[PDB]
């Protein structure tokens, strides 16, 4: 297993380390519930240095990305603007979900997950080649996500004056380089905050300063509860190469217009959308218990006919005080379902695939 | 972390003998550390007869359901109903408010085979 440059900082902060996709990472630092509460109510931070940052440069960068991705980077017209997009195979299945930043006409950046690093890099370098793109894998950078209603103010205590000037009033989904800090208003929690990427040799001391600024260290346990409440997908669970983005609540990130932009998978996706697909929904179990991954989700239709879907991610929501789950299900589901939890058929409410907006329950 | 005066089990539970001869049972600091934050506990029925090793309660964390075993044979005489409302007491007070159930032990030979504080410290030491 490999470790980030923060491994020692995590131990001084009391991390319980686990192996995560070949990375030793903190599962929590004492209490994953408290960690979740810190992000919802104040500031918490996560070591995201196992993500890979890819810089792409060259005159055909935009053109390349318009073909590679199912969202349309032509929508990025202001310097530093980011979007979320799927990156599909030829069959329209999801290879990854990623974020991409536009800096100049000839300079974009992708951030990809740890678990999909090698597959994504091969797919990208395979497809970029005929476009003549200079592709830089930035393993020289670490990254920290600082999240919560006080996260931006706490982090900005560490910024110099030029860095504060650069991010003043910055809106969501922008990133800007300001000295050795790349500061972006992105995250995986439902809350405001930054993800800050910086050189590996600077990351330990920056983490230390953030702790001292009153930002709580938060591990993978809270990262799951927060992202799931916020209705955000985890690759491998909500989607993978066998799953259409239309069946993983990624429909909103497909930029169908302009019609004349072909992208990898678009043909297959148009065919999928015409045949219709399953859909990712939210489940809430208010009865005692916890929904778990890969459990069957069953409902009986208008006619007496049974249909079955599956939980893609389940957890206990500390903000709701109930278990929640995301689940991929046949079209036709109504307002309730049943999930089989160890020999017993638990009723659940079926909702939109999001549970918390702005620290508040969405029902 | 290991109160001097309690008796201990290999399944990482403690037992406190009460004035009336019954035993209060919980999980140890070590055990709760490994479980992580508790979000639900499923308690046995008051009056249930258990044998040592029966899975008779369930601790549920955000990550996993985890079985709790009877450390000795006997009858459940009480369970900790505060845990329905405050399951996190198992984490913050594993020897105090986080007690799980109370048992009337039916077998003295089991009791004589439980670990003292020192012999538990050594089971961790390992």
From Swiss-Prot, chain A:
One of its GO terms (biological process) is one-carbon metabolic process. The keyword Nucleotide-binding does not apply. Pfam families: GCV_T, GCV_T_C. One of its GO terms (molecular function) is aminomethyltransferase activity. Keywords: Aminotransferase, Transferase. Its EC number is 2.1.2.10. It catalyses: N(6)-[(R)-S(8)-aminomethyldihydrolipoyl]-L-lysyl-[protein] + (6S)-5,6,7,8-tetrahydrofolate = N(6)-[(R)-dihydrolipoyl]-L-lysyl-[protein] + (6R)-5,10-methylene-5,6,7,8-tetrahydrofolate + NH4(+). It comes from the Bacteria. InterPro entries: GCS_T, GCS_T_bac, GCST_C, GCV_T_N, GcvT/YgfZ/DmdA, GcvT/YgfZ_C, TrmE/GcvT_dom1. Belongs to the GcvT family. HAMAP family: GcvT. NCBIfam families: gcvT, PRK00389.1. The glycine cleavage system is composed of four proteins: P, T, L and H. The glycine cleavage system catalyzes the degradation of glycine. PANTHER family: AMINOMETHYLTRANSFERASE, AMINOMETHYLTRANSFERASE, MITOCHONDRIAL. This is Aminomethyltransferase. It comes from Escherichia coli (strain K12). The gene is gcvT.
UniProtKB/Swiss-Prot annotation, chain B:
The modification N6-lipoyllysine is found at residue 63. SUPFAM superfamilies: Single hybrid motif. Residues 22-104 form the Lipoyl-binding domain. Keywords: Lipoyl. NCBIfam families: gcvH, PRK01202.1. This is Glycine cleavage system H protein. It comes from the Bacteria. One of its GO terms (cellular component) is cytosol.
């Amino acid at each position: 297993a490999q470790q980030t440059p923060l491994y020692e900082q995590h131990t001084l902060c009391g991390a319980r380390m686990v192996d995560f996709h070949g990375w030793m990472m903190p599962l929590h630092y004492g209490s994953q519930i408290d960690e979740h509460h810190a992000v919802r109510t104040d500031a918490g931070m996560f070591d995201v240095s196992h993500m890979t940052i890819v810089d792409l440069r060259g005159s055909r960068t935009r053109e390349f990305l318009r073909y590679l991705l199912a969202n349309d980077v032509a929508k990025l017209t202001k310097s530093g603007k980011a979007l979320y997009s799927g990156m599909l195979n030829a069959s329209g299945g999801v290879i990854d979900n990623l974020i991409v930043y536009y800096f100049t006409e000839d300079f974009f950046r992708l951030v990809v997950n740890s678990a999909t690093r090698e597959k994504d890099l091969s797919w990208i370098t395979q497809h970029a080649e005929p476009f003549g793109i200079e592709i830089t894998v930035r393993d020289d950078l670490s990254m920290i996500a600082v999240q919560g209603p006080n996260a931006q103010a706490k982090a900005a205590t560490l910024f110099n004056d030029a860095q504060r000037q650069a991010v003043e009033g910055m809106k969501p989904f922008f990133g800007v380089q300001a000295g050795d800090l790349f500061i972006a208003t992105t995250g995986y929690t439902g809350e405001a905050g930054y993800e800050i990427a910086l050189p590996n040799e600077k990351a330990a001391d920056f983490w230390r300063a953030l702790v001292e600024a009153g930002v709580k260290p938060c591990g993978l346990g809270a990262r799951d509860t927060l992202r799931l409440e916020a209705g955000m997908n985890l690759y491998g669970q909500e989607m993978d190469e066998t799953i259409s983005p239309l069946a993983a609540n990624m429909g909103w990130t497909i930029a169908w217009e302009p019609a004349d932009r072909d992208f990898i998978g678009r043909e297959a996706l148009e065919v999928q959308r015409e045949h219709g697909t399953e859909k990712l929904v939210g489940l809430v179990m208010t009865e005692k218990g916890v929904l778990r991954n890969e459990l069957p989700v069953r409902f009986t239709d208008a006619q007496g006919n049974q249909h079955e879907g599956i939980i893609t991610s389940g957890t206990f929501s500390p903000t709701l005080g109930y278990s929640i789950a995301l689940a991929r299900v046949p079209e036709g589901i109504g307002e309730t379902a049943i999930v089989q939890i160890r020999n017993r058929e638990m009723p659940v409410k079926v909702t939109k695939p999001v549970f918390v907006r702005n620290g508040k329950a969405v029902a | 972390n290991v109160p001097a005066e309690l008796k201990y089990s290999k399944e990482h539970e403690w037992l406190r003998k009460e004035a009336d001869g019954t035993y209060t049972v919980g999980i140890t600091e070590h055990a709760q550390e490994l479980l992580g934050d508790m979000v639900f506990v499923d308690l046995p029925e008051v009056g249930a007869t258990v044998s040592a090793g029966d899975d008779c309660a369930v601790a549920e964390s955000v990550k996993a359901a985890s079985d709790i075993y009877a450390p000795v044979s006997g009858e459940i005489v009480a369970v900790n109903d505060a845990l329905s409302d405050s399951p996190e007491l198992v984490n913050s007070e594993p020897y105090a408010g986080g007690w799980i159930f109370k048992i009337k032990a039916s077998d003295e030979s089991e009791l004589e085979s439980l670990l003292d504080a020192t012999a538990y410290e050594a089971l961790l030491e390992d």
